[PDB]
UniProtKB/Swiss-Prot annotation, chain D:
The lineage of its organism: Eukaryota, Metazoa, Chordata, Craniata, Vertebrata. This is Anthrax toxin receptor 1. Residues 6-177 form the VWFA domain. Glycosylated. Glycosylation is essential for Seneca Valley virus (SVV) attachment and entry. Phosphorylated upon PLAU binding. Disulfide bonds join 1-182. It is found in: Cell membrane; Cell projection, Lamellipodium membrane; Cell projection, Filopodium membrane. It comes from Homo sapiens (Human). Glycans are attached at residues 128, 146. It is linked to Hemangioma, capillary infantile: A condition characterized by dull red, firm, dome-shaped hemangiomas, sharply demarcated from surrounding skin, usually presenting at birth or occurring within the first two or three months of life. They result from highly proliferative, localized growth of capillary endothelium and generally undergo regression and involution without scarring. GAPO syndrome: An autosomal recessive disease characterized by growth retardation, alopecia, failure of tooth eruption, and progressive optic atrophy in some patients. Belongs to the ATR family. Interacts with gelatin and type 1 collagen. Interacts with the actin cytoskeleton. Induction: Up-regulated in cultured angiogenic umbilical vein endothelial cells. Residues 1-182 are extracellular.
Length: 238, 268, 258, 182, 34, 51, 51
C-alpha cells in the first residue's frame, strides 16, 4: 500500500520567493564555455564602491539648454557667510538621483553603514585656497553659519600638488539598519545635513581666470551593506 | 619618476608627465588563448604589427558645453580612416580574415598650460553604438568637421537615438521611448577611466583586455571598445593664452588573432 | 586623503581614515547576484490560439496580410515588438485610428538594477490564466528554430499539428497552472544586454542580436478547430531567473527630474 | 457668404529645428501679428515622436499672446511623426463641428522636409480623411527643395511653398479671403 | 547557493537539472593600477 | 483594528517574534491573490497597458 | 507612535484585467500566529470592568 499522507493548507499555490526548484521539461543539454572572458561579479558591492558624479541644481542663471543641472561647484569671489553646498542625507533626494549607492539603493529597502563622499579640485596650479567640509547630526533647525558647522564634525583642506580629499560621513544611529527613503521624514531615515564652507579666500595671481571649480563623488565605504529587496520604480520608461 | 618609455615593434612613445597605467578586470591583460570555436590554424601575432598607430582628433574651445563628447569606434576606426589614422598593414591583414580578436592599449593626448582649468574624461565604454542617428547609415569621415563635438542631447540620455527598424505598414506607427543602449553622464565613471585635467597630468592611459558576447566576433561589423572623451567643466583663459589646444590619440593592439583566408573584402 | 581621485582607482575609507572610531560589522548578504535575481516575475499577457496558427512576417509588411498577431511571446528581457526581436520599446499612448497595434513587451524592473554588460542564466516558465474556469495547453520551440503550422484531418475534424511533435508540451488541470524550468539553448556564448553588430554581413539594421535569446511560449486549448467559441480569452506568462552570472559592469537607466 | 476661416498651425519640434527654431518662431510671431481680426480660430500643436496640444480654440487673444510666448518653452527633439499632428487637429475639428457651422478649416504646416516610406503613407492616410470632411491643406518646408512627396498631402502643386517667395505668398492666399468676413 | 532548502537531496541528477560545460583541454577587487 | 485577546495576557514591555500570514475568503467560489511589501517601504501603484 | 517598529501589510486582489470588474464588492479575512517569541521587563494588564 501507499504511504499515508496529509496535504496541508498550502495546496497548489506558488510563492514568488519560494526557495525550491521545478522539474525541467527538457534536459541533458550542454552549453558554450565561459572561462575566456574576464570580469565576473560575485557581489554588486564590488560594483558599488566605484566613484560616481553627483548632480545639483544650477545656480540662478538658467541656461535654456537641456537639463540645466551641474556636476560641479562655482565658488564666488564675494564674501558672504553662508555655505557653498548643503544637502541632506536621504537616499531619494534630488541630489542623490544618479549616484551608484543611490541607484542600487533605490530598489532595496534597508542598508547599514558609512557613505564616502570625496571631492576633486580643478583649477590653475598657481591658485590656492582653504576649504573645510562639515557634517552635523539632526538638530532642530539647520546649522547655517561657521560656528554651528564648526562645533560639530569637520575637516579643513589645502590645495597643493594633489587634487582631492577622501571624506567619510560617520555612521551614528539609533538602530543598526537604516531605511533608504523616507515616507515620513523621521529620525530613522534622515541623519542631518552636510555642507562645505570656504574658510579663507581663493588666492590667485593676475591674468588667470576667476571662480575655480570642484567636482563631487559619492561611494560606499567598507561597512556599507544592503538587505531585503523591493519592487522597482518603472518611471524611467515613461 | 612619472616617465614611461613604452617601446613596441619599432615605435616608442613616452609621456614625461604621465600618471601610470590602468588595467581592467585582470592585472595582466595581454594573456589569452586561441579561440575554441575555430578549427583552422589561427594566424597569431607578428612583430611587424605590434605598434602604436596615432591619429588626430578634433580640437576644443570655449564654446563647448558640459557632457559633450567625441567617440571613436574600434576597429571600425581603422576602416573609414578618421583623422589621418589608418591601420595600413593592419587593415590589409584584417580585410582578409573573417574572424578577428584582440585587446587594446590606449593613451590619449592633450597638454594644457599652467594657467588653465577644465576637466576632460577619457573612458572606453563597452559595446555601444555612439556613431549613428537612426537613418541606418553609419556616419563617415566627411561629417565630423561640421560639429567638432556631439552636443549631448536628451535623446542619448533616454536612449532615443539608437537605429530602429522599418515597422512595416500593416501596423500602426509607434511611439518609442526607450532603448537599452544609452549614455547616462552622471554615471559614466564606472568604466576604466581617469580624469585628465590641467591640474596634474598632460597625457594619460587606459588599458583593456578582451570582452565579447561570443569567443570571436566577426571581422568588420563588431565594435566592442568605443572610446569617448567628454568635458565636465569648460576651459577659461585670458587673452594671450594659447587658443584652442589640440587632441590626438594612440592605439595599440595586443596579441591579435586572425582566422580564415579569402579574397580582399569588397562591400556588397 | 590626501590621495587624489584622478588616478581612476580609489579605495574606500572607514571612519579611522581620518577620524577616531572603529569599523562596523557586516550586516547581510542579500547582494550576491545569483540570489538577487531569483524572483518570480511576469513579463506579459498572451491571447490564446485556437486554430491553425500563422506567424508574423519579416520587417516590412504591406496591408492585406493575414497573420495572427499577439499569440506568441519571444521570452527575453530584451525589448520586443510584435513577438519578434526589436531594438527599441514602444508605448502606444494615442491609439485611436486604423492599423493594428503591435504587441510590445519589456522586462521593466530588470534594468533598474542592471549594471552589467553581459549576462548568463537559466529560466523557468510559469503560466496562469486570468479568465475563470479554463483549461489550456502550452507549447514551445527552441531559439534558432521556428514553429510548425499545418493541419491534418481526423474523422472529418481538422486538427492542427501543435498537439504533437518533438519539443515538449504540457496540459494543465481544471484551472491549474503549469511550470517547469528551462535550460540554455542559444547558439552564441553569453546573453548580451548591449550590442554593436548586425544580423548579416551587410545591409542590416545595426543593433539587434537575433540569435542570442531564449525561445517562446504559445497557449492553445485542447479542442478541434470547428468547435471554437466567439469570445477571445487571455493568459499571462511569468519568468524567474536561475543560477545567474554577470560580467564587465556598466550604467543604469536614467531617472527623471522632470 | 461665410467667414469660414479657422487657421491651424503645425510645427516641427524634431532635432533638425535645432539650428532654425527662432526663425520658425519669428515666422509664427509675424503670422499671428498679421491680422487684428477676431473672426477666426487658432490652436497650437506640435509633433515630436508624440506630445500634446498647446492651446484649445479660444476667443479673445490674450490667450494666444500667452501661446506665442510659451512657444519658447519646448526643446527641439523627437522623431518626425506629423501624421499625428493632422490627427490632433482633425479630432477636435470633426467633434467640435456639431454646432452646425460652415467653418472651412485651413491648416498650414512647418516641416523640415523629408520623411520616409511608411510615415508618408500614414500622413496620406490622415490627409484623405482631413479634407474628406472639407478641410483646406497647406505645407511649407525649409530644405533642399522637393515638391515630389509634399504635393500629395496638398490638393496639388499650387499649395506647397518655397521659403523665398512664401514670406509674402501665403499672405496673399489669406488676405484674398479675409476681406469677405460677414 | 542562491535560496534553497535542499540540504538533504535533489531528485534528479545534476546533469538533468542544469547544463554543464565543455572541455577545452574573502573577495577580489576589479582592476589594479600597476 | 486591534489584536483583542493579546493584551489580556500581556504583562510585558518589550516583545520579539516572527509571524505567519494565513488568509481565507468568506464569500464562496472565489480565487484571489495576496501581496506584501516590507516595513519602512511603500506600495507601488501604476498601470501599464498590454494589448 | 513608533512608526517604524512594525511588520508590514497584506492586500488582496483578483487576477483579472482592470476593465472586467464586477459591481459586487467582496471580502476576505487575515490571520496571524506568533512564533519563537521572547519577552522583556514585565508590566501591567488591561483594567477589568466593575462596572
Amino acid at each position: 500500500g501507499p504511504i499515508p499522507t496529509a496535504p496541508r493548507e498550502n495546496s497548489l499555490m506558488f510563492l514568488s520567493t519560494l526557495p525550491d526548484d521545478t522539474v525541467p521539461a527538457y534536459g541533458n543539454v550542454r552549453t558554450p564555455p565561459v572561462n575566456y572572458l574576464p570580469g565576473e561579479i560575485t557581489d554588486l558591492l564590488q560594483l558599488a564602491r566605484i566613484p560616481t558624479l553627483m548632480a545639483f541644481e544650477r545656480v540662478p542663471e538658467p541656461v535654456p539648454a537641456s537639463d540645466t543641472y551641474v556636476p560641479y561647484v562655482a565658488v564666488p569671489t564675494q564674501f558672504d557667510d553662508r555655505p557653498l553646498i548643503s544637502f541632506p542625507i536621504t537616499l531619494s533626494d534630488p541630489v542623490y538621483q544618479n549616484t551608484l549607492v543611490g541607484a542600487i539603493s533605490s530598489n532595496f529597502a534597508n542598508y547599514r553603514g558609512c557613505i564616502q563622499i570625496t571631492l576633486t579640485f580643478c583649477g590653475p596650479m598657481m591658485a590656492r585656497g582653504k576649504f573645510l567640509l562639515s557634517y552635523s547630526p539632526p538638530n532642530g533647525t539647520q546649522p547655517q553659519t561657521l560656528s554651528e558647522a564648526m562645533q560639530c564634525t569637520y575637516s579643513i583642506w589645502d590645495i597643493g600638488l594633489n587634487s582631492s580629499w577622501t571624506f567619510v560621513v560617520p555612521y551614528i544611529s539609533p538602530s543598526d539598519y537604516r531605511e533608504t527613503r523616507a515616507i515620513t521624514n523621521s529620525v530613522y531615515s534622515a541623519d542631518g545635513w552636510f555642507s562645505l564652507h570656504k574658510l579663507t579666500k581663493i588666492t590667485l595671481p593676475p591674468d588667470c581666470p576667476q571662480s575655480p571649480c570642484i567636482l563631487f563623488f559619492a561611494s560606499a565605504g567598507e561597512d556599507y551593506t544592503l538587505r531585503l529587496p523591493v519592487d522597482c520604480n518603472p518611471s524611467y520608461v515613461f | 619618476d612619472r616617465v614611461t618609455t613604452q617601446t613596441a615593434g619599432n615605435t616608442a612613445i613616452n609621456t614625461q608627465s604621465s600618471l601610470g597605467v590602468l588595467c581592467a578586470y585582470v592585472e595582466d591583460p595581454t594573456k589569452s588563448d586561441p579561440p575554441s570555436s575555430s578549427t583552422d590554424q589561427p594566424t597569431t601575432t607578428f612583430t611587424a604589427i605590434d605598434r602604436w598607430y596615432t591619429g588626430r582628433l578634433n580640437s576644443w574651445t570655449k564654446a563647448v558645453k558640459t557632457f559633450s563628447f567625441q567617440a571613436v569606434p574600434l576597429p571600425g576606426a581603422f576602416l573609414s580612416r578618421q583623422g589621418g589614422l589608418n591601420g595600413g598593414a593592419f587593415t590589409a591583414t584584417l580585410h582578409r580574415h573573417f574572424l578577428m580578436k584582440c585587446g587594446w592599449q590606449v593613451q590619449v593626448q592633450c597638454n594644457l598650460t599652467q594657467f588653465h582649468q577644465g576637466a576632460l574624461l577619457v573612458a572606453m565604454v563597452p559595446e555601444t553604438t555612439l556613431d549613428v542617428k537612426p537613418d541606418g547609415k553609419a556616419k563617415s569621415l566627411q561629417e565630423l568637421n561640421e560639429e567638432q563635438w556631439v552636443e549631448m542631447s536628451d535623446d542619448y540620455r533616454t536612449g532615443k537615438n539608437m537605429p530602429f527598424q522599418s515597422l512595416g505598414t500593416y501596423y500602426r506607427p509607434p511611439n518609442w521611448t526607450w532603448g537599452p543602449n544609452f549614455i547616462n553622464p552622471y554615471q559614466v565613471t564606472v568604466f576604466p577611466h581617469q580624469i585628465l585635467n590641467a591640474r596634474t597630468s598632460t597625457s594619460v592611459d587606459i588599458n583593456v583586455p578582451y570582452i565579447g558576447e561570443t569567443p570571436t566576433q566577426s571581422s568588420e561589423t563588431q565594435n566592442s571598445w568605443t572610446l569617448l572623451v567628454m568635458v565636465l567643466v569648460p576651459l577659461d583663459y585670458k587673452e594671450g593664452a594659447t587658443t584652442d589646444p589640440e587632441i590626438t590619440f594612440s592605439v595599440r593592439p595586443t596579441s591579435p588573432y586572425f582566422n580564415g583566408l579569402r579574397n580582399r573584402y569588397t562591400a556588397g | 586623503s590626501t590621495d587624489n581621485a584622478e588616478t581612476g582607482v580609489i579605495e574606500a575609507g572607514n571612519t579611522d581614515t581620518d577620524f577616531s572610531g572603529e569599523l562596523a560589522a557586516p550586516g547581510s548578504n542579500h547582494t550576491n547576484v545569483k540570489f538577487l535575481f531569483d524572483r518570480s516575475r511576469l513579463l506579459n499577457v498572451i491571447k490564446v490560439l485556437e486554430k491553425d496558427a500563422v506567424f508574423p512576417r519579416p520587417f516590412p509588411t504591406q496591408e492585406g496580410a493575414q497573420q495572427d498577431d499577439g499569440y506568441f511571446c519571444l521570452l527575453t528581457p530584451r525589448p520586443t515588438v510584435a513577438s519578434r526581436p526589436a531594438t527599441r520599446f514602444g508605448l502606444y499612448a494615442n491609439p485611436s485610428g486604423s492599423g493594428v497595434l503591435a504587441n510590445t513587451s519589456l522586462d521593466f524592473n530588470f534594468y533598474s538594477l542592471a549594471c552589467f554588460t553581459y549576462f548568463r542564466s537559466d529560466l523557468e516558465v510559469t503560466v496562469v490564466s486570468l479568465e475563470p474556469d479554463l483549461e489550456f495547453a502550452v507549447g514551445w520551440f527552441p531559439s534558432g528554430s521556428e514553429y510548425q503550422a499545418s493541419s491534418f484531418v481526423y474523422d472529418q475534424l481538422h486538427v492542427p499539428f501543435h498537439f504533437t511533435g518533438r519539443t515538449p508540451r504540457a496540459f494543465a488541470s481544471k484551472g491549474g497552472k503549469v511550470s517547469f524550468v528551462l535550460p540554455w539553448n542559444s547558439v552564441s556564448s553569453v546573453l548580451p544586454v548591449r550590442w554593436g553588430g548586425a544580423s548579416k554581413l551587410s545591409s542590416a539594421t545595426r543593433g539587434l542580436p537575433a540569435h542570442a535569446d531564449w525561445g517562446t511560449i504559445y497557449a492553445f486549448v485542447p479542442r478541434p478547430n470547428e468547435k471554437k467559441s466567439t469570445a477571445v480569452k487571455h493568459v499571462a506568462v511569468y519568468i524567474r531567473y536561475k543560477n545567474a552570472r554577470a560580467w564587465c559592469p556598466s550604467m543604469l537607466p536614467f531617472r527623471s527630474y522632470k | 457668404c461665410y467667414g469660414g476661416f479657422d487657421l491651424y498651425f503645425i510645427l516641427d519640434k524634431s532635432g533638425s529645428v535645432l539650428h532654425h527654431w527662432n526663425e520658425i518662431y519669428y515666422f509664427v510671431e509675424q503670422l499671428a501679428h498679421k491680422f487684428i481680426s477676431p473672426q477666426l480660430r487658432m490652436s497650437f500643436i506640435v509633433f515630436s515622436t508624440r506630445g500634446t496640444t498647446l492651446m484649445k480654440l479660444t476667443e479673445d487673444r490674450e490667450q494666444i499672446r500667452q501661446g506665442l510666448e510659451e512657444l519658447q518653452k519646448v526643446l527641439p527633439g523627437g522623431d518626425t511623426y506629423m501624421h499625428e499632428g493632422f490627427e490632433r487637429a482633425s479630432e477636435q475639428i470633426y467633434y467640435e463641428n456639431r454646432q452646425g457651422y460652415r467653418t472651412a478649416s485651413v491648416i498650414i504646416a512647418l516641416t523640415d522636409g523629408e520623411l520616409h516610406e511608411d510615415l508618408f503613407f500614414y500622413s496620406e492616410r490622415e490627409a484623405n480623411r482631413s479634407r474628406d470632411l472639407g478641410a483646406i491643406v497647406y505645407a511649407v518646408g525649409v530644405k533642399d527643395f522637393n515638391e515630389t512627396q509634399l504635393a500629395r498631402i496638398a490638393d496639388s502643386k499650387d499649395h506647397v511653398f518655397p521659403v523665398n517667395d512664401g514670406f509674402q505668398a501665403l499672405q496673399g492666399i489669406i488676405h484674398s479671403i479675409l476681406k469677405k468676413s460677414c | 547557493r542562491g535560496n534553497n532548502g535542499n540540504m538533504t537531496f535533489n531528485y534528479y541528477a545534476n546533469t538533468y537539472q542544469n547544463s554543464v560545460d565543455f572541455s577545452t583541454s574573502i573577495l577580489n577587487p576589479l582592476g589594479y593600477l600597476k
